[model samples]
Target chain A: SLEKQIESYYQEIAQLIIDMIPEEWAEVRFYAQEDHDGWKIFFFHYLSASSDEWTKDIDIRDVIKVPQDEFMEKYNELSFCISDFRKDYAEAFGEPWMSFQMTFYASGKFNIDFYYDKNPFDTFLTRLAWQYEHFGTIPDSFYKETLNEYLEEKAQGKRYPFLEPLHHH
Target chain B: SLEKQIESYYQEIAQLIIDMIPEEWAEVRFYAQEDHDGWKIFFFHYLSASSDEWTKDIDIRDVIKVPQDEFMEKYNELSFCISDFRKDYAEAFGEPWMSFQMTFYASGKFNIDFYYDKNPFDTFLTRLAWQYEHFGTIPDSFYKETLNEYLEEKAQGKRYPFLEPLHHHH
Candidate 1:
């Protein structure tokens, strides 16, 4: 019965993804874990490169977890429709603190960290460009100054950005 | 009538590609041109880094062209069954005269050239590896001897192969 319920949840979530993001370019991954509270679902979404609607003009690493009891309560309350689920949880994240990396958990004790879209190097450059556009090249700290210097070197010299793995057509 | 025939031919060719290679990994692009001889198809196969079965181990520049009348005749005679197409035309190509590059026509006598897999640099290394494994590093010409020097330099130092524009996943 639990397996059947989880399968149903997966179908609902997949439908929500297809409705929200471009089916050709977006990717969705689900991770389930058992806690003292019971199983929880962790949903990961990678928006398309052309999708600036939900990611604030860049890739956003956002995760939403629904606990077993709360999930069932919500599922039962809603006539099997996840339209509210998408609106309440799947909105654009505004300005991540790290901007490049996010960690997802398989359990309370185990977690895997990953990049959701661009390579870390490209994301670093993206952050710098974002800062430059807003702050007009003001470096307030030693670390910022070092980063600014590295950015300058990258700007003046020939640089090869690291390539991501190819996507099949 | 010609449009319908071409469309039918494409369906068969697509099926042939899928049956011959991993359908998901290999990409086939067909370029059509009208020369003095009639319409011809320049087939370009871009195999992913993971595929080495038919494209390599082997640049296969095998060109197959049937004139409009001949193609129609063959189509009618065979009852549209092109099951032998793979065995008849698509086989592992022997050692390429030029391993890394092949030429294809675009249109109006213009030519486009490319490597079947990997960048030129990687394919050059591939040919070198094949040659050394089979012939004990014996080059056939001064150009190849110079290529051998470049290969040696590449072997001794750090290198980053140029990435094609297809990669979207990391």
Candidate 2:
């Protein structure tokens, strides 16, 4: 049921993206996340290097303007579709994943990737069980230092600006 | 017709990736390209952070060994499905694109990205027409210097290792 609902949300979101992307735009990328803070849908597009859209004569706001707040509200409502999914994950498995990335092309190519390398929240702990079974540390904590460095950078403002806390609970 | 055929190849290749990926593999990425050099299907996978599979006890080649030669041959043949697509693109437009990147998740998420930023060949010239019309250089060559730097890196050794010349035409 959760899978079906999530897929529906994606299909709907895909059409919205197709509608807003610039005609001369050759590519678009979307990143989505739902976590302790809440849901975020981030997007960016690329135009042909030679398109007149690059001229300084036109301002970007004149060509296209995204209703960021309205879009986020709809995104959060649609993301409600994942409440059951999130509940099952948190209680049994811990926050299931960190985020999702999607890329699209005008000629009909689409791909989605969900990040699972990091805990969806500091509270994410189901992996701890497996960690104990596997060993005290992985490959003697092979990539642990890498994560540590990344965490430090995140603390120093390397994190996505839009992903900062939005909801409390 | 070519559109129909290329989709078939992607569908088939998607199945093959599904087969070889380990159960513990949470994520996988695939990059495909058919350009002046040739066709190559590059793949990489990730295992659960805590999966024992990451232990040195097991050799990576043991769990999944892609028959690189066989896969390439199959990929090249399937790529033939794009001959018309390429022929038309080059004559009418120019090399269509440089490459494609696909990412898949066991939970049923898939995304494909086709890079049109670079010419599929030194011969790819359709964009040159647009370039000429647009002006001598972009934003006075806004990202041109960036491209120049990237091309220099590509020449030195920054290009994909597996994409080295396979088929040559004179």
Candidate 3:
């Protein structure tokens, strides 16, 4: 069961990350531009010597098919959550390794870079995605409970759909 | 086999962490310090949570176990490595979460506290320990081969283990 839960946790986090990628790119939704899942995927890609440079440069039209402002608003919400997590990490672990950002253009090409002062993506994951591990179970009930609340709020408003074709990832 | 290798790597890093605890404070190492076996353990303990105080008043004895002169002398030998690592981290990570020193009395209990803006402990671990982890099996092998080579060349003249009791954790 512990093993199942861990498996599920990994799957869910992986899904949550997949759910985060934008179908397209724009400055407004740069929050969608880079997410925890992307960074983890990137970090581990570097970790395992695999890679995903193309993702950074993928076209938004090919991915999300959404309004730039709407996408960015979602990005801001997630960014706030991420920043909160980094403050906590700094307090606990002493300091961050670094922060990174990448941007993709319509041509399916992008440049990648990071710095000591900036790692919005890393900050987001350290703050958000990693917390799921603390619960020590997968198909996390807490995440499920919170997701429900989050979806309901979106449902009440005209924001993003609770489930979208792009969300399935 | 890869998982086992990673696990061994994690365990060695964990042991390295355990070794960092001074000869004086073996009884409560895990209970008292910020530590990890790998990035995973580090995420579990520090990254996942929001600012855990490792008990108010960090046990300074844990931080400054090696005497200052000895640390400085050895550090002077590796000055460029130390200086580069220090400068890069400070520029990148900002100031330390905290830094300090403490002394224990003859009774072997902590007695005083001191603080300078130094964060060598955290900086070193972030830069070096993470590199060791990344080097994974290859890095481990390289260090082993190099250390053996260093040992073979040690002129057999001036060397002694300054660390005492020399016990290892299970």
Candidate 4:
């Protein structure tokens, strides 16, 4: 039943992210621990210019589109929807603070941080799991897989286990 | 039916901007004939803020809620979509660049502008027209009205009637 509930939550959250993606893409995860909470859903975004991960306008429209008020109004509306969803679901764990940044075009440098989450590695897997389940995975989807494996191995507390395990089959 | 086509373009673009705003706003005109070419569009984006209009970072996520990458992707896609829409609809009017600004927590002021084609005013209204047709419009929607007057005066080659009109719209 616990696994079933988890699966259901995953499916629900996936659909939610998909719905909000045009407005913004978000990631959710669950962490089950007898010693701790049942799940931790971290919502965040990924970007092309990794440097803009924190400092610059997260939304690219600033460089190439409409007014900011218009962009932000839509942005807030979506986040509100996510918060509502979170309230209804009420996962046992906490979510990431969801910080942002910008990259200097002149220098091609950007700043990024996970805010104040204790286990970014696990959160990384959570994001990968969502990507894998929703988008379907392939061997080369190693973008998040390699990182996922490392996180899974080092989950509770352990060295990254080097193995012949499938990367993303 | 060039007028109809232009109007249709106007509504679509106006809607895009409307979707971003929380309340009703106006796009004003800045017209010029001698200084540059046609018209230019400029509006006050209440949601916009920055250290400067030309170059400054203003994150709108807290206001919109989407992930930054997804937002940027959506923004670019919207741009590409509009560009294509213009190409498909009006090939003769020419394609003009659309620009705007948003404010951030770091700054509380509004940053707004449009691509200036030699003449800042014409470029300003042209952007507004693009915004109105491709986007949409709302009441207090003076962007259309004010620009029309300036363009009328501008066509006569008067002494730059569009210059001081910008003060009333904000």
Best by TM-score: 4
Worst 10 residues of 1 chain A by lDDT: A32-41
Candidate 4, residues B1-170: lDDT per residue as tens digits? Answer: 97687556444444444444433333312211211121112332332223322111133344554334443433433333344443454357564443332222222222223332243343335444433433353213555575565457557975431233225996
Which pairs clash inside model 1?
none
Worst 10 residues of 2 chain B by lDDT: B121-130
CA RMSD (A), model 3: 19.9
Rank order by DockQ, top first? 4, 3, 2, 1
Instruction: Give one digit per residue, the lDDT tens place, for model 2 in A51-119.
Output: 733111012323545432223223323343343344455675555555555556667566655565443
CA RMSD, predictions in order:
24.1, 24.0, 19.9, 19.6
Candidate 2 regions exceeding 4 Å error are A1-7, A22-24, A39-41, A46-60, A65-95, A117-169, B1-170
TM-score of B-chain for each predicted structure, in order: 0.25, 0.42, 0.22, 0.35
* Candidate 2 global Cα RMSD: 24.0
How do the residues B47-68 of candidate 1 rate in per-residue lDDT, one tens digit apiece? 4445533242112312223212
* lDDT of candidate 1 at residue A95, scale 0 to 100: 21
Q: After TM-score superposition, what is the CA distance of residue B160 in candidate 2 from its true location, in Å?
A: 62
What shift in Å separates residue B58 of candidate 4 from its native position after superposition?
A: 4.5
- Cα lDDT, model 4, residue B8: 62
Score each candidate by Cα lDDT. 0.32, 0.41, 0.29, 0.36
Those runs of model 1 whose alpha carbons end farther than 4 Å from true positions after fitting are A1-169, B30-44, B49-170
- lDDT string for model 4 (A1-169, tens) is 6556544544443444333333331222222111112123334343334343321223244454444434434443333333333433345435422321111122322222123333334433544443444334432455555556754655767632111111999
Q: How many residue pairs clash in each candidate?
A: 0, 9, 12, 52
Candidate with better TM-score, 1 vs 4:
4
Between prediction 3 and prediction 4, the one with superior TM-score is: 4
Model 4, position B128, has a per-residue lDDT of: 44
Worst 10 residues of 3 chain A by lDDT: A40-49
